[PDB]
């Protein structure tokens, strides 16, 4: 019963709005403290730069127009409210692709006397991320995401991480992919005095073995046969066909090898390289 | 008399008794004024075989108006609030050469209003154009993309279109590592359609962007201008072999197998036909 | 922030050995820990490391099979169990933590000595030094209270209260055959000794053993 | 595994000196980022490692301002100037590049000051140990530097290296100066067998050895 | 079940039920009228979140109306398309079983508000279609409580374990039986005698159609390198020898 009074309290349009945010004594900032808890990376689409994670992020912000007396409501300490209906920082990715751009679930927050809240949505975010691809497989990725409210600029609101690293209390092992360290940092551009952004920084590591035994193996089992055909004595007649056929899988293994690495043309894998090394190799041998 | 209350108060005033689709002039015969801009986040993707340029876009747009004017110096010196841009007009820009995608910004976000009656609207967006791709100096390409930006229900005799900056903005671009912009050109332009009797403003933005070559030269061509060197040498080897016929067939359907994988990549148009595409039938042919 | 381990421990050799690390004013299980091996002769060599999030190891190549981490996420407890055990691994051991690429090491563990010899208890023990029988007299003379057959460490032999505590000199443990031998020398001034009463104490908190034992001349 | 060489072993410099150290790698050690990350360490006795010099071009939030490293992409250098009493233990290597991390082999650093004059003395077997049966002969040896020395034993003229345990101590603070305790272990029935045990120490700042003997039977 | 994206795709209707003293009434007055169908929009809604999504809905949305008998009760039943992440075990490929969990919770509420107790031991399977593909074996609910660094109370939650086979007649009659025959020739060659002179063919012949296979394998099972499939396993020491 109470409760429904408090909310009736709280959340009266006549005495409280949403559109504005809270401050008192000329403007102040409102602090806002942020931290990010990684569940598990699902994919990483490498050919098309996308790294899909499932994120619970965390946001703290004092708020004084919500603060009620605790001792008339039977001695209430936390209330629970609607999202969409008090205030909210809006902090979102930049980098983001797929047009995506805000939390899904937009959950409900809880409240107490003092006046402080402490909000936590999950979400599915796709960030953009370079692949440094050059030790294929045996590499890291350096993948960033960003935060930044894209509403307000540093006069009104000012983000404080709580920790510096991501949390994985709620991690699973991702199975392909490893992580190694989850760095976080507040970056501060002092030429544009107003602009202000949380990174992390994922760098993840390839178990390799799925793709060694897969590629590695048949590419240079397949391409031992290069220094091979001189040893076949030319009266049979047959180095033609041998030859040939090797020729012809190692552009198969290239076409593939070219597949499946994004094309960054800002580097050439190694692995491809050495093939094309021995494919200029080879067609010397059949000439 | 905290800054909340004060504002609260001033949001209360301006929006009495104002309607959104009255469009905010001093009289009927005055015209406004649109500054338009753009700013690439990152180059989604350019799909020469749909021909299609998936693009990620921050649009500027700047005005002003007089009804949502005030005075600084009677609500605690506030001069710039913000406010979800649905509660208030919005001229519709839309471009024109769209291909199944978002006509106009779906996100909606809030916009900046100054105490002279200033207003400033900056969106995020996903589109999607049509480039009318040229492939012919395969990889080693030039592409020209063209966007056609203007409004829909306003003629020039009521909204006039005028550019803020000659060039696209890059202060926030992503590196793609497939595609570098050469350079990016606004143009103002008038049409006159046939609807109607009145003249409507567009603003043309063209891209002149370049391939980066090292990849495709590394996995598409350098095979086949390989293999392409065997076609010759069957004649030097001796017939009483016998395998002369092998290498033939072997080096023509090798040439199909490339010819026939390039044609999916390269698109399919019958405007002009690509230059490895004319020599590999150059080479089938010999 | 702030570290805790596990106390002494000992062990016959062949057995398993399973020490603890506790952490707390930091997000445990954010980022790796990694322990240090230090042998009391010499050189600091690594065990491994582990993240406490997931079940990523990895060991160096020279003590594979040798150790086998485990992590724990509701409790902040990383453990390590241990293999066939030798008398050639009895060390210190540590635990730091670690965060690869970035700011990293910037705290550690308090140390864990572990110690395997075959033994169970000997109570520490009283032989005097007395000078020799032909000798000059100078004018200062250093003193001997020797000990012999402890186990385990530490010990402590000290002189009557520090009352002579300028000029002292403690080993470290050397073993024998099984077990350890110290002892401790002073120089003090012939003129006093004759006169003054002096006696070495010793004392063994493990094994709560305090005895003293008056040096007198010959 | 990437191996790590430091150089020297043992660097004595005297207060207020300049030291360098050098740290050589078995590969290079530099990050496809353009960046070397490797650590440095302290180690005081008896407790546990402190940080000095993380990112080489960096320098830690907490250390003074005396220390300073440098390096070429392979060959790195510690550089201290002005060695305070504070600044006294061991240095250790880590590298930041490959999987798995390694550390160094530990680089000794004390201080250095003028000679010293070994005091050396032999103390027979006690009457407890009599008692008991046994017979332990301490050779003291306080107070020398550097500790380039040795103990030689002698039993009625013969060479002695079976039972001999030999310890030494570090640089001690307050007189700079080295011990070595060297005791021999025999039993009741030998000593009543043999007349002449014999104590040399020979160090550099003698030109004789340093002989102490004693007789059974007198 | 796409096991090389390691994403099951699922259709669920969910049944709640609970009740409340508010929205109670006397049939007696009404005409003797017992239950109403309301749009849940309306009234109040306990939040019910899967914690395994991947590309998919965390709340079911579809909003569809719910039931209110006389005394208070009150019944809903939305239907959703989940799309949840299992490790799958690729060994015994195909003869293989698969184990998918799906952990539904509450959100914003701690056990000394809101307890889940589960009606049935087991998934109702009546209104169940047949896939031709996939049979369950089983389908097993776990009622369980865990804490959070968020907060201080425990949290509740129930996860469904579904232990599943796949039927292998399409794979083993289109994919290993296909190179388990032509296995059958490695060995072949060696009967066969030099001076006719065809037999590095054969050989060209059999490797190339096993690495054709073994990149074709490659794209069902899932790039997971915890373990190697049995069937890369047989076709890579084919290739070997
Ligand atoms: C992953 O990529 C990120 C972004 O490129 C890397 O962060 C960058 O790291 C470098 C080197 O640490 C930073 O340079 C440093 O900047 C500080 C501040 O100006 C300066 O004091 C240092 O001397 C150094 O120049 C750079 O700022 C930073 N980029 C940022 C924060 O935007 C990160 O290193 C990469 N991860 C790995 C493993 O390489
Ligand atoms: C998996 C691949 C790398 C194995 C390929 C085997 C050849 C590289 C080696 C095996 C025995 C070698 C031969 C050993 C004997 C000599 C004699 C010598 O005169 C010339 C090279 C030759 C034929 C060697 C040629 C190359 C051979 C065939
Ligand atoms: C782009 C295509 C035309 C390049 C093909 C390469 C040939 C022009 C060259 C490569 C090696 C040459 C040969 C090198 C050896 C000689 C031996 C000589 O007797 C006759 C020409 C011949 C076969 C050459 C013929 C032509 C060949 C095949
Ligand atoms: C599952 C795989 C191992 C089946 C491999 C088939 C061979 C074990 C069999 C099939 C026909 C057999 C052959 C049939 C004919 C004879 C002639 C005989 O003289 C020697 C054995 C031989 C070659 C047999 C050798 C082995 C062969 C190749
Ligand atoms: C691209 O096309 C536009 C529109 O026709 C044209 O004006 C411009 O010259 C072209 N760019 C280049 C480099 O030719
Ligand atoms: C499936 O996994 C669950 C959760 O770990 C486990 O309890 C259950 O035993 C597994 N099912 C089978 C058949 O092993
Ligand atoms: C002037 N607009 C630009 C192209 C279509 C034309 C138009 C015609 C009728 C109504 N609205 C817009
Ligand atoms: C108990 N929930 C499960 C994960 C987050 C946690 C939580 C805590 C407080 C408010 N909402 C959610
Ligand atoms: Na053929």
């Known amino acids: ?287 | ?286 | 922030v702030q570290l805790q381990q596990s106390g002494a421990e000992v062990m016959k050799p062949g057995a398993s050995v399973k020490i603890s690390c506790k952490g707390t004013g930091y997000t445990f299980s954010s980022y790796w820990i990694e322990w240090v091996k230090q042998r009391p002769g010499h050189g600091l060599e690594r065990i491994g490391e582990i993240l406490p999030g997931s079940g990523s190891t990895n060991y160096n190549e020279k003590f594979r099979g040798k150790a086998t981490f485990t992590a724990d996420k509701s409790s902040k407890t990383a453990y390590m169990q241990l293999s066939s055990l030798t008398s050639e691994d009895s060390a210190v051991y540590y635990c730091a933590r670690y965060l690869p690429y970035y700011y990293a090491m910037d705290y550690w563990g308090q140390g864990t000595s572990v110690t395997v010899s075959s033994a169970k208890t000997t109570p520490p023990s009283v032989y005097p030094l007395a000078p020799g029988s032909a000798a000059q007299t100078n004018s200062m003379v250093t003193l001997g209270c020797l000990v012999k057959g402890y186990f385990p460490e530490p010990v402590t032999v000290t002189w009557n209260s520090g009352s002579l505590s300028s000029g002292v000199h403690t080993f470290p443990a050397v073993l024998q055959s099984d077990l350890y031998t110290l002892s401790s020398s002073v120089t003090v001034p012939s003129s006093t000794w004759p006169s003054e009463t002096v006696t070495c104490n010793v004392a063994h908190p493990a094994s709560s053993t305090k005895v003293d034992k008056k040096i007198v001349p010959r | ?218």
Not at chain 1, 59 to 85: A, C
Not at chain 2, 223 to 246: A, H, Q, R
Not at chain 4, 127 to 136: C, D, F, I, N
Not at chain 4, 152 to 177: A, F, H, M, P, Y
Request: net charge negative; aromatic share 12%; glycine share 4%.
């Open chain 2, 1 to 286: 008399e905290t800054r909340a209350h004060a504002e609260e108060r001033l949001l209360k005033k301006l929006f009495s008794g104002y309607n959104k689709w009255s469009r905010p002039v001093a009289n009927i015969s005055d015209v406004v004024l649109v500054r338009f801009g753009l700013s690439i986040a990152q180059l989604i993707d350019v799909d020469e075989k749909n021909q299609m340029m998936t693009t990620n876009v921050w649009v500027k747009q700047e005005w002003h108006d007089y009804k949502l004017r005030w005075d600084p110096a009677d609500y605690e010196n506030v001069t710039s609030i913000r406010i979800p841009s649905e509660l208030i007009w919005r001229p519709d820009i839309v471009l024109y050469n769209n291909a199944d995608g978002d006509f106009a910004v779906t996100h909606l976000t809030k916009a900046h209003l100054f105490h002279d009656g200033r207003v400033q609207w900056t969106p995020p967006a996903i589109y999607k154009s049509s480039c009318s791709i040229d492939v012919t100096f395969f990889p080693f390409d030039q592409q020209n993309c063209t966007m056609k930006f203007g409004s829909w229900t306003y003629d020039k005799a009521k909204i006039d279109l005028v550019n803020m900056h000659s060039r696209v903005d890059q202060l926030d671009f992503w590196e793609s590592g497939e595609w570098v912009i050469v350079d990016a050109v606004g143009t103002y332009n008038t049409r006159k359609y046939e609807c109607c009797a009145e003249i409507y403003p567009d603003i043309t933005y063209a891209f002149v962007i370049r391939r980066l070559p090292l990849f495709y030269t590394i996995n598409l061509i350098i095979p086949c201008l390989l293999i392409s060197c065997l076609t010759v040498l069957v004649f030097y080897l001796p017939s009483e072999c016998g395998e002369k016929i092998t290498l033939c067939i072997s080096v023509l359907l090798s040439l199909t197998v490339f010819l026939l994988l390039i044609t999916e990549i390269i698109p399919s148009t019958s405007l002009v036909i690509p230059l490895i595409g004319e020599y590999l039938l150059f080479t089938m042919i010999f």
């Open chain 4, 1 to 218: 595994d990437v191996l790590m060489t430091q150089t020297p072993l043992s660097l004595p410099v005297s207060l207020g000196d300049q030291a360098s150290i050098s740290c050589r790698s078995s590969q290079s050690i530099v990050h496809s980022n353009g960046n070397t990350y490797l650590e440095w360490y302290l180690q005081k006795p008896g407790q546990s490692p402190k940080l000095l010099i993380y990112k080489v071009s960096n320098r830690f939030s907490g250390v003074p301002d005396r220390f300073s490293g440098s390096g070429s992409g392979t060959d790195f250098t510690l550089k201290i100037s002005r060695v305070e009493a504070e600044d006294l233990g061991v240095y250790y290597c880590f590298q930041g590049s490959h999987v798995p991390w390694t550390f160094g082999g530990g680089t000794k650093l004390e201080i250095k000051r003028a000679d010293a004059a070994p005091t050396v003395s032999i103390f027979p077997p006690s009457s407890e140990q009599l008692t008991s049966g046994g017979a332990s002969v301490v050779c003291f040896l306080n107070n020398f530097y550097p500790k380039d020395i040795n103990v030689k034993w002698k039993i009625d003229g013969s060479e002695r290296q079976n039972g001999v345990l030999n310890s030494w101590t570090d640089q001690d603070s307050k007189d700079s100066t080295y011990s070595m305790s060297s005791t021999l272990t025999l039993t009741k029935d030998e000593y009543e067998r043999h007349n002449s045990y014999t104590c040399e120490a020979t160090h550099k700042t003698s030109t004789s050895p340093i002989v102490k003997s004693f007789n059974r039977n007198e």
């Open chain 1, 1 to 287: 019963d109470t409760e429904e009074r408090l909310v009736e309290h709280l959340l009266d349009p006549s005495r409280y709005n949403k559109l504005i945010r809270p401050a008192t004594n000329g403007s102040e900032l409102v602090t806002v403290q942020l931290m990010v808890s990684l569940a598990q990376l699902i994919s990483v689409h490498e050919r098309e730069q996308i790294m899909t994670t499932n994120v619970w992020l965390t946001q703290e912000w004092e708020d004084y127009r919500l603060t009620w007396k605790p001792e008339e409501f039977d001695n209430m300490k936390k209330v629970r409210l609607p999202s969409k209906h008090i205030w909210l920082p809006d902090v979102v990715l930049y980098n983001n692709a797929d047009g995506m751009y805000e939390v899904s679930f937009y959950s409900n927050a809880v409240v107490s006397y003092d006046g402080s809240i402490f909000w936590l949505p999950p979400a599915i975010y796709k960030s953009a991320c370079k692949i440094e691809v050059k030790h294929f497989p045996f590499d890291q990725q350096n993948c960033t995401m960003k935060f930044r409210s894209w509403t307000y600029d540093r006069t009104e609101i000012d983000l404080v991480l709580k920790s510096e690293v991501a949390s994985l209390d709620d991690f699973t092992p991702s199975g392909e992919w490893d992580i190694v360290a989850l760095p976080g940092r507040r970056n501060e551009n002092p030429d544009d005095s107003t602009y202000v952004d949380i990174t992390y920084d994922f760098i993840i590591r390839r178990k390799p073995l799925f793709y060694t035994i897969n590629l590695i193996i048949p590419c240079v089992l397949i391409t031992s046969l290069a220094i091979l055909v001189f040893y076949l004595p030319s009266d049979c007649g047959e180095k033609m066909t041998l030859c040939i056929s090797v020729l012809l899988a190692l552009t198969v293994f290239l076409l593939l090898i070219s597949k499946i690495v994004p094309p960054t043309s800002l580097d050439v894998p190694l692995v491809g390289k050495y093939l094309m090394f021995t494919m200029v190799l080879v067609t010397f041998s059949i000439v």
